[PDB]
Design a protein around this nucleic acid. Structure first.
Lengths: 89, 87, 59, 58
RNA sequence: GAGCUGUAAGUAAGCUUUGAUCCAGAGAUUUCCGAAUGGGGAAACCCAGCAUGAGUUAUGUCAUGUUAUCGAUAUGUGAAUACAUAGCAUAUCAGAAGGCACACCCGGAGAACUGAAACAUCUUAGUACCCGGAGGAAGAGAAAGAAAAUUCGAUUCCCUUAGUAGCGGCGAGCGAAACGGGAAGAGCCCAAACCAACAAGCUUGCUUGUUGGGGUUGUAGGACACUCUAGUUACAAAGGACGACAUUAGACGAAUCAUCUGGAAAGAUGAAUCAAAGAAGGUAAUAAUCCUGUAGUCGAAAAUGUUGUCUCUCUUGAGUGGAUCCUGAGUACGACGGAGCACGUGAAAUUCCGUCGGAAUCUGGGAGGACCAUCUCCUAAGGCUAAAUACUCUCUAGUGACCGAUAGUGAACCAGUACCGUGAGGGAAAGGUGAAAAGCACCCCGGAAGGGGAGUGAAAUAGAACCUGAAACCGUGUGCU
RNA sequence: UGAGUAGCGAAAGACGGGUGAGAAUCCCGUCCACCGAUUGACUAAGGUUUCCAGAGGAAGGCUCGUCCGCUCUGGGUUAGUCGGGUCCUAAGCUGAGGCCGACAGGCGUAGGCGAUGGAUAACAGGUUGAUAUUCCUGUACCACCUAUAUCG
RNA sequence: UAGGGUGCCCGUACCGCAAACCGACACAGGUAGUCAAGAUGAGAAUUCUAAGGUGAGCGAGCGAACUCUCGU
């Protein structure tokens, strides 16, 4: 999944191309709240709304590019590593 | 024991008689002997007497789906020395 | 119901036919007799068919 | 829950948590004086643990 | 491995990297009823005996254990009948009881409407319903068989013979088998004759009753006299110890970017990559490369199942000889009355039942469709048994030229429920906002309902009486009459 | 469609003052009228919260409704003596052993359950919006317990 | 005749000739028992009233035919 406190980039939607931090996560429906993405106006105050986790992609710590994440076992535990580079992210 | 559940703070039939009488909701399978000894063991009073009455389960609480409430048993105790059995 | 003690004889069921073959259900009982036979524990009187009472019993 | 205490201390604990804390909080939540209502479900579960381990000892 | 306190929204109070919530194996707790079982009973309640403990000066009131009936079994078991033996009493027992898938299986009892273009035989049909008994399957099962060859060698099922031979108001109709080709492949233990012990008893002849050995046959075989030296707990006799797999959570898992339309890209236009993975679902539209996944490989503290070897058991196998002895009795069979065999009492063999009568003992006994003689095959009157076979309340994967809310379950919804009946019992109807509640702040008329704006939205004749929105029906305006 | 048609379920109301967006229909009042061996008072079945106070007016009420046996929110049933159990038994049901019976089960003894009947200690007055021999005041009665020959 | 204290469980509200029970209905029907005033009288009859309750959940007009109930 995508745990919060992560800097992502929006791959689809009408916010696509932006990037922010993950704030909240609703993993029973695969929704995440990004900062500055999907600003909604409710009766009149303005907030962020959830976006399906299928739409945001993590940024490579090396080249700032959206990649996939895999898992390795450096020790008796898991580590996440980018797909373009191989550095823990 | 904890054969006493709740104090019953109502308008008149519990505050107009709180000069000496104290009303509780108790368990539904107890005596007035059990309650008379339980009050004296909990609060350290001398309980002069105790009256008990049963209440049937009302069907009043009905939302989208109709249902009944709980049957409840209410006990009034008259003290001979002491006070403060519901605050 | 009843049945022979020594052997197992018991009534059976069959048809009873007219001269036109009109069938009707009927029974065939056993020839049970109240006989006081001698078992240890006590001599007890029980049903025994007359077919078992011939040639060998205690009474 | 790793209580690991003397069985008589287990009985003192069930008899303390059993009425005193829980019965007091049950009166307070009725007469309109208890906030921090989540104490109640705490004490209840404590009174379960003290019982279970004593039964494990038999 | 980062959030969580179900729906169910919201508040309040909280828990969590010192590993919550969650998933799996094991353990603990488990109120009252209900076979309900201490007694009673209008299920879910009332009233008790006894032992022990908590409380009170003391009674009153509590907590826990136990107390039904039948069966067997040890003891006390000693009447009317001396004594004994019916009763009566105590102690012990994972003993029974009830339920459920009236799907399958065996047994007991057993219709009718219908057909024959009537109906009495006959058919429907040994079907429906009912009752008892199990089991994971059951029933059958190791030739007193089939037959007519240069023979076969338990049973069960299927294909075919064959709608044949037969049965029959010989009407309507009912209807085989043997062979032959195959699935599957377990065969064995008793009774009896005789040998050694055991009481009681009238010589010791007591299987006079008890026990162990023995022995299972048609090739007649066994006892009897004689020599001479494999386990198979699914039958065979039943109790334990011994490492690999399977189930019950899981982990890794290749490869895509840019432009146009758009509220939104997966679409169109370009280039590019993976593939033991191009099954499928989601994602703001139509994705092999965005997510969950798929091909492949890896994993198990603990519980269970199955399975291999090693223990643990068990356990003298054949060949001759013939004096004599044994080889399942009120049985086989017959007459009378029924039933069952495809077979309706017929010339009716083979097989069961009720009532009467009643055989032989290896030169024996039975069968080869009345019956007799000669030939051939077999050895009843004792019992157990796996596989091939039938069905599905239920769990795990998956499929469909199956339905798509008047359909598919009666029930896609909180349905066997509103309800309706004294009762047994009968029984519906009800789907859809949007991609995301962003579910209309605020102003105006109105008491509120309800509008008209203005905002959210890509859309508000999308505003929760929410997709689309048709016909009957109800209106408002108008062109010609 | 019939069609704004039939009906609106036996009966005496009139005015004044309120409240209210709205009054023949709700609240208070005076006059009149009806029952009075009953339309009055109390209780057994049977219903089962319908009882009270504060709010409400979508639907129910054969019209209206500012009201209600209707909707919402909070309340209300108090026993040693009253009626039942811890007492008895009609009719009937059930029944250890037992008798009969294809099965299922039918009948039945000791015993048991069982009222509509028998036995059995409390009366006046006061009090609340809602209890009343039940709560309170006064005055009593019965059974058992502990202190300072009787049982049958 | 043989031999000074303790006192439990269930019901209790409300309607009960009725708009709350049995009749599908706020339905002229049905529903056991107790109490029982005055004038008049045989009287629990008849007429008028007491204690107490009630004015009945559609009205306002007009005063045709015809139907229903009532008087001459």
């Amino acid at each position: 999944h995508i745990k919060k406190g992560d800097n992502v980039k929006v791959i689809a939607g009408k916010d696509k191309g932006k990037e922010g931090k993950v704030i909240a996560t609703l993993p029973k429906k695969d929704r995440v709240v990004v900062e500055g993405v999907n600003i909604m106006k409710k009766h009149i105050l303005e907030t962020e709304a959830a976006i399906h986790v299928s739409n945001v992609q993590l940024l490579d710590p090396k080249t700032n590019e959206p990649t996939r994440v895999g898992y390795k076992f450096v020790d008796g535990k898991k580590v996440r590593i980018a797909k373009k580079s191989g550095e823990e992210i | 024991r904890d054969i006493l559940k709740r104090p019953v703070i109502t308008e008149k039939s519990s505050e107009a008689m709180a000069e000496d009488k104290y009303t509780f909701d108790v368990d539904t399978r107890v005596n007035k002997t059990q309650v008379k000894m339980a009050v004296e063991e909990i609060f350290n009073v001398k309980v002069a007497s105790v009256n008990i009455m049963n209440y049937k389960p009302k069907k009043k609480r009905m939302g989208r789906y109709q249902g009944y409430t709980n049957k409840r048993r209410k006990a009034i105790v008259t003290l001979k020395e002491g006070s403060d059995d519901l605050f | 119901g009843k049945q022979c003690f020594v052997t197992g004889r018991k009534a059976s069921t069959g048809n009873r036919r007219s001269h036109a073959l009109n069938s009707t259900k009927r029974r065939w009982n056993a020839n049970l007799q109240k006989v006081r036979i001698l078992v240890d524990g006590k001599p007890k009187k029980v049903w025994v068919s007359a077919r078992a009472l011939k040639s060998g019993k205690v009474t | 829950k790793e209580i690991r205490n003397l069985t008589t201390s287990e009985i003192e604990e069930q008899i303390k948590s059993s009425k005193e804390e829980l019965f007091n909080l049950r009166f307070q939540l009725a007469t309109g004086q208890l906030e921090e209502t989540a104490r109640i479900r705490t004490v209840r579960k404590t009174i379960a643990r003290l019982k279970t381990v004593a039964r494990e000892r038999e």
